[PDB]
Amino acid sequence: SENVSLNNISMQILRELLQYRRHLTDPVKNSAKEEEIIKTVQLPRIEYFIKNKKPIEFILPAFPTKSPNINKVLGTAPDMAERLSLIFLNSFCQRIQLYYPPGARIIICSDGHVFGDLIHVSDEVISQYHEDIKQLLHEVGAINLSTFNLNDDKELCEHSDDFNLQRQMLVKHYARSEASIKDELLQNNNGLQLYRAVTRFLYEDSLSNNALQKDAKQRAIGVIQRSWAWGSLLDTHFPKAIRLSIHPQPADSIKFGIHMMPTRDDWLTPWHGVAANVNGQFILMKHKEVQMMGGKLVNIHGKPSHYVI
Ligand SMILES: CC(=O)[C@@H](O)[C@H](CO)N[C@@H](Cc1ccc(O)cc1)C(=O)O
């Protein structure tokens, strides 16, 4: 039949994605059955675009703001690790074109303002970080990548200002009760490990140790509640889009987690790390670990960009 050509194209795309999959690493996991499951979830969503001879569109909520802990990152502004990551995502769409002529697009849905309050990061800085990321997309020629922000939705408040109000509106319309978020979080080991990870990152950036513990635990549920709301919003806007994610994700999930630079931490993202050249390969690592390595900082455009070891 005529499906063999279509089924060939979709499977080449899925196989390329699988090369970059972000997942909880555990050697007791059968990887072969995991991939078999992912095939059953994503191949239909992929073929929807191929049948209609439409470019494959991907959603990725990512790059909200730079982490404020200087022990983790180099500067408030986006750095090489962000640049490498954008360059990678764009070139990922570019090669789909050789297999498929329409090619693909990735909408980066920057979640910066949605949880800005809970990160204790100025909306002014988040807006600045977003602006620079659009500027990096032009610097690099990332013609397949585009940006979606809370400001963009017509339904949520018109104004960029009163982001607080935008946050309130998003939570009322698209959020879920924190108790539901916590209850759901505590069924899976998927949800368990998300909760742990998000608390850890919130703790680290915040350095009265107990008040600091219980607070990170409470803010974590908050930040997850906001981010799932954001996803709900995206889930309505771009329903047939393939859902990329910056977090590990179970194989049955609709979301597909993805890496953008080499790293040994499944939870690391370039806005929580720096770029290190070791043995001719750039890697994503926390700022402090590189300093222990003794690698020397390299500054481009004046602002520090990366560390070379
Ligand atoms: C479920 C989530 O919403 C998070 O996982 C989130 C996704 O965007 N990434 C971060 C959160 C974070 C980001 C910027 C910052 O300055 C501080 C914290 C994380 O993993 O901890």
Mutate to test the pocket of ligand 1, among 182, 259, 260, 271 (most ligand atoms within 8 A of CB): 271
Neighbours of 228 (CB within 10 A): 17
CB-based contact 272:64 (threshold 8 Å): no
CA 243 – CA 256 distance, rounded (Å)? 6
Which residues have C-beta within 8 Å of that of residue 23, sequence separation ≥ 6? 34, 248, 249, 251, 257, 266
Ligand 1: which atom is nearest the Cα of residue 68?
Answer: 16
Q: Is 106 helix (H, G, I), strand (E, B) or coil?
A: strand
Q: Show the tokens assigned to 46.
A: 């992929």
Q: What is the whole-number distance in angstroms between the Cα of residue 64 and the centre of ligand 1?
A: 8
Nearest CA to ligand 1 atom 15: 67
Nearest CA to ligand 1 atom 10: 198
CA 206 – CA 119 distance, rounded (Å)? 9
Amino acid in the structure at residue 12: Q
Neighbours of 276 (CB within 10 A): 23
Ligand 1: which atom is nearest the Cα of residue 224?
Answer: 1
Neighbours of 192 (CB within 10 A): 12
Neighbours of 90 (CB within 10 A): 18
DSSP state of 261: S
Ligand 1: which atom is nearest the Cα of residue 198?
Answer: 21
Sign of CA dihedral 290, 291, 292, 294: positive
Mutate to test the pocket of ligand 1, among 184, 206, 272 (most ligand atoms within 8 A of CB): 272
Helix (H) or strand (E) holding 131: helix 123-140
Ligand 1: which atom is nearest the Cα of residue 63?
Answer: 8
Angle (deg, nearest 10), helices 209-237 and 178-185: 100
Sign of CA dihedral 156, 248, 266, 144: negative
40-71: buried (b, 16+ CB within 10 Å) or exposed (e) per residue? eebbebbbbbbeeeebbbbbbbbbbbbbebee
CA distances (Å), origin 58, targets 80, 89, 128 = 23, 10, 25
Nearest CA to ligand 1 atom 16: 67
Experiment used for this model = X-ray
Helix (H) or strand (E) holding 104: strand 104-109
Neighbours of 113 (CB within 10 A): 25
Ligand 1: which atom is nearest the Cα of residue 227?
Answer: 3
Domain boundaries, the chain: 3-308
Q: What is the whole-number distance in angstroms between the Cα of residue 198 and the centre of ligand 1?
A: 7
Q: HSE of 70 in the Cβ direction (CA atoms, 13 Å)? A: 2
CA-nearest of 45, 107, 60 to 260 is 60
Q: What is the resolution of this structure in A?
A: 2.9
Neighbours of 246 (CB within 10 A): 23
* Pocket around ligand 1 at a 6 A CB cut-off: 64-65, 67, 111, 119, 121, 197-198, 201, 205, 223-224, 227, 246-247, 267, 271
